[PDB]
Each structure stands twice: as structure tokens, then as C-alpha cells.
């Protein structure tokens with residue numbers, strides 16, 4: 422989750438993650454591109470405000486007041502610069518001066534030409550096989566991060582797409598208990614609470630940026646899946662897109678799709694929750710997908726209706742107390758899918774984003790594994806298009822987004838876990854076209 426440069430004994434010892442940009446005069450002489458004016462090494466801001474109660478709750482979780490368990494100094498960039506060392510630009514800008522506005526367009530995957538479709542799944546496949554040039558992932562919790570001999574950082578290289586999967590797993594994993602310790606309350610830094618929409622927003626942005634980097638195609642954009650069709654099939658589960666059903670195992674992907682070759686990460690909950698370890702970069706086992714195949718829950722075998730999207734955009738409040746999966750008249754809880762499309766919570770309703778996950782009846786539905794099915798990307802670009810439309814209709818009314826007593830990870834000014842450099846929910850609560858340099862090509866149901 423941290424730059425390779427910072428995953429060292431010395432940098433953890435200093436508490437400082439301020440890598441060089443262009444260290445012409447030797448190591449440490451252009452931290453954060455300070456010698457060119459691009460940024461400065463400064464103290465991290467981290468939300469201190471209180472969260473909703475948990476029984477029991479030790480507070481030993483390395484995700485509290487993120488990222489302070491590891492670093493308390495990052496790069497703060499000036500102007501429209503950003504990046505872990507301020508070597509790149511804020512979203513929406515390009516150039517060595519970061520002064521050319523760029524605007525990329527995210528579109529319906531089904532609207533793409535045959536050429537762009539092939540480019541997408543090949544780009545996706547590439548990002549699955551290519552080492553992240555920048556981030557490395559911890560395989561051990563903080564108290565063991567430096568190894569048995571105390572001089573060996575427990576960090577692994579990981580692929581671009583697997584990093585996208587890893588960050589999601591880390592945000593939902595259970596707090597370790599140990600030996601003799603009671604069952605700690607279950608927590609979720611990226612679902613069941615207001616930060617769900619902004620966490621996943623940044624999640625996508627980080628993948629888009631990493632893939633534009635990988636391809637050296639600055640305008641590359643992530644497309645989206647309109648799952649609000651009422652359909653009883655998955656209309657992008659074809660061999661020229663996300664993969665059709667295997668004729669040999671009806672829960673596998675057709676061997677004629679590259680995605681049948683993908684192998685998953687983070688599928689060892691039993692190992693982690695007992696050995697005390699974290700998901701690592703070693704893959705094991707294929708994607709399972711079985712659209713409409715959940716015969717035990719008939720509600721989970723059709724997709725959301727088109728009016729479900731239009732109706733949830735009528736919920737005027739962004740979120741409501743207790744800012745949880747049981748909130749009512751809360752647009753966040755509606756689009757996430759724990760309340761019905763009108764606003765009304767019911768513990769039996771599964772709608773929209775949650776409905777779309779369960780529909781897949783496979784790897785795409787398990788909360789710790791779901792990004793391993795690449796349909797995750799396009800399910801979430803769609804969800805984010807709904808978020809972006811809401812932000813527009815209601816001029817980004819951030820007021821009902823709680824500053825405190827939200828579930829842990831979800832306070833308005835929390836640094837979304839485990840993204841780097843630190844980045845608050847507030848920074849994602851903006852219309853995308855003007856403030857984040859992307860927009861959606863989408864028409865909304867007009868009822």
C-alpha cells in the first residue's frame with residue numbers, strides 16, 4: 422500500500438514517506454519534487470473525530486487514524502501537482518507544468534467499437550500480469566512488519582490489477598483477535614456507511630491512472646456496465662468481453678476468454694484470520710461466476726430494473742443516521758443496495774449495487790474477493806455514475822455526510838483506507854467533470 426521506496430526499515434523508523442522525484446544532488450535532495458517547487462514533505466492530517474461504537478473494540482487495528490500507524494509525514498504537492506512524490510498531475514490535468522486540462526469520458530462497455538472492446542480486455546489482462554511500478558503490499562500486520570529478525574520488511578511486489586484487489590481486501594478484513602481474545606466487532610472501511618461511494622470512487626480513479634501509466638495512453642478510460650436492465654442474464658458475459666459460461670464447468674469462464682486464465686488473490690480467510698497474516702501476491706484458483714444461478718434466493722436472480730436507478734436519485738439526503746446498512750431515506754444506503762430504491766430500509770431488500778454483485782453467484786459476490794472478477798470494475802464505474810449524477814442534481818450537498826460517529830473508516834475527513842498518499846472522503850465528494858477530469862456518457866431514465 423506504500424511506495425516501494427518507503428517499505429524499508431529506515432523509512433518506517435523515520436515515520437516519513439517522502440520519496441525523491443529527481444535526486445540529482447544525491448539521495449534525499451529532491452523529496453516530493455521540492456527542488457523544482459512541485460511539493461513538500463509535511464505532517465499527515467488524519468481524522469481524530471470519534472466513530473460509532475463497537476463491542477468489543479481494542480483500538481489496536483492498524484487501520485485506525487490511517488496512515489498514522491506507519492507514517493506521519495507524506496508529500497503535500499503544490500498547485501495541480503500530485504503523486505506519491507508529486508511527479509505527476511492532479512486528475513484532470515496534464516503536462517510538465519500540469520496546466521493542460523484533459524477530460525476523459527467513461528462509456529457503456531456495450532457502446533464501444535469492436536476495436537476498443539479488444540483494447541479494454543487486453544489492457545485489463547495486461548494490468549493483471551504486470552508488476553505495479555510503485556506500490557508494494559504488506560503481508561504482515563504492523564507488529565510483525567519487519568520480520569522475525571526485525572530487519573526484514575514483510576512487503577511483496579504485486580501486479581497492477583492485484584493491487585486493486587488487495588486494497589479492497591484490506592479495507593474489509595476482520596480485525597485480528599489472537600489467542601484468548603474475544604470475538605471483536607466486525608468492521609468495514611469501505612461499505613455499510615457513507616464512505617462506500619467515495620472509497621470506491623477513488624478505487625476506480627487509482628486503477629484508471631495506473632492503467633493509463635501502464636499503457637502510456639493518458640486518455641484511457643474505464644468503461645461501465647449498465648446492470649439496471651431487469652435482465653436475467655449478464656449481457657457482457659461474452660467471450661469478446663468479460664467471458665461467457667464454460668461449457669465444461671458452468672461456474673467457470675469460457676476457456677475462450679483470457680479471464681478463464683486469471684487466478685485470484687486473497688482467498689485464504691482461514692489462514693489470515695488464524696495465522697495472523699495478510700493477503701499476499703500468490704494467486705490460487707480461478708474466478709467463479711454463475712449469473713442468475715443462485716437458486717436458493719430467487720430475489721438474487723434478476724438485475725435491478727431501470728426505474729430502480731431513477732427512483733433512488735429521488736432520495737435527497739446523501740446519508741442518514743446511524744450511517745449504516747440499516748439507514749432509511751439515505752441515498753447512499755439505497756444505491757449501495759441495503760434499502761429499497763425509494764429509500765425504505767428492509768433487512769430483506771437487496772437492490773442495485775448489492776443486487777448486481779449477488780446476481781453473479783460467484784467470486785464477484787464475496788466481499789473480500791469480489792474485485793478478482795473484472796466485472797467488478799464495470800459494476801462500480803456504473804455505481805459511480807449514479808453517484809456523479811446525484812452530486813450534480815443536489816449541488817454536492819455534503820452536509821448530511823457525518824463528521825463523526827459514522828462507522829470506523831466513514832467519517833467525512835477520514836483518510837480512505839489504505840490509499841496512498843492519504844486522501845479523504847471529502848476530496849472525492851465533487852462533481853467529476855469539473856473537479857476530477859472525467860465524465861460519463863450516460864442517459865438516465867426519465868419517469
Ligand SMILES: *[C@@H]1O[C@H](CO[C@@H]2O[C@@H](C)[C@@H](O)[C@@H](O)[C@@H]2O)[C@@H](O[C@@H]2O[C@H](CO)[C@@H](O[C@@H]3O[C@H](CO[C@H]4O[C@H](CO)[C@@H](O)[C@H](O)[C@@H]4O)[C@@H](O)[C@H](O[C@H]4O[C@H](CO)[C@@H](O)[C@H](O)[C@@H]4O)[C@@H]3O)[C@H](O)[C@H]2NC(C)=O)[C@H](O)[C@H]1NC(C)=O
Nearest residue numbers: 432433434435436437464465488489490491492493494563
Ligand atoms: C512521527 O514519527 C516519528 C517516527 O516514529 C516512527 O514512525 C511513527 C509513524 C510510528 O510508527 C512510530 O512508532 C515509529 O517509531 C516519531 O519519532 C519517534 O517517536 C518515538 C516515540 O516517542 C521515539 O521513541 C521513543 O524514544 C524515547 C527517547 O529516546 C531515547 O533514546 C535512547 C534509546 O533507548 C534512550 O537510551 C534514551 O533514554 C533517549 O531518551 C524513549 O524514551 C521511548 O521509549 C519508551 O517508549 C516506548 C514507546 O514509545 C516503549 O516501547 C519503551 O519501552 C519506553 O517506555 C521511545 O522509544 C523515537 O525515537 C522517535 N524517532 C525519531 C527518529 O525521532 C515522531 O515523534 C512522530 N511525530 C509526531 C508529531 O507524532
Ligand SMILES: *[C@@H]1O[C@H](CO)[C@@H](O[C@@H]2O[C@H](CO)[C@@H](O)[C@H](O)[C@H]2NC(C)=O)[C@H](O)[C@H]1NC(C)=O
Nearest residue numbers: 711714715716717718779781782783784786787
Ligand atoms: C451460489 O448460489 C448457490 C445456490 O443458490 C449457493 O449454494 C447454496 O447455498 C445455500 C445457502 O447457504 C445452501 O444451504 C445450499 O446447500 C447451497 N446449494 C447448493 C446447490 O450448493 C452458493 O453459496 C452461491 N455461491 C455464491 C458464491 O454466491
Ligand SMILES: *[C@@H]1O[C@H](CO)[C@@H](O[C@@H]2O[C@H](CO)[C@@H](O)[C@H](O)[C@H]2NC(C)=O)[C@H](O)[C@H]1NC(C)=O
Nearest residue numbers: 473474475476606742743745746747748749766
Ligand atoms: C442499525 O444497527 C445498529 C448497529 O447494530 C443498531 O444499533 C444498536 O442499537 C441497540 C438499541 O438501540 C443497542 O443496544 C446496540 O448496542 C446498538 N449496536 C451498536 C453496534 O451500537 C441499530 O438498532 C440499528 N438502527 C436502526 C435504525 O434500526
Ligand SMILES: *[C@@H]1O[C@H](CO)[C@@H](O)[C@H](O)[C@H]1NC(C)=O
Nearest residue numbers: 425552553554555576577578
Ligand atoms: C520490484 O520491481 C522493480 C522494478 O519493477 C525491481 O527493480 C525490484 O528488484 C523488484 N523488487 C523485488 C523485491 O523483487
Ligand SMILES: N[C@@H](Cc1ccc(O)cc1O)C(=O)O
Nearest residue numbers: 775778779785786787788791
Ligand atoms: N449483501 C452483499 C452485497 C455485496 C457488497 C459488496 C461486495 O464486494 C460483495 C457483495 O456480495 C454483501 O454485503 O456481501
Ligand SMILES: [Zn+2]
Nearest residue numbers: 478480485829
Ligand atoms: Zn477506534
Ligand SMILES: [Zn+2]
Nearest residue numbers: 461463497498
Ligand atoms: Zn504544502
Ligand SMILES: [Zn+2]
Nearest residue numbers: 589611612621
Ligand atoms: Zn466494495
Ligand SMILES: [Zn+2]
Nearest residue numbers: 774778791801
Ligand atoms: Zn461493490
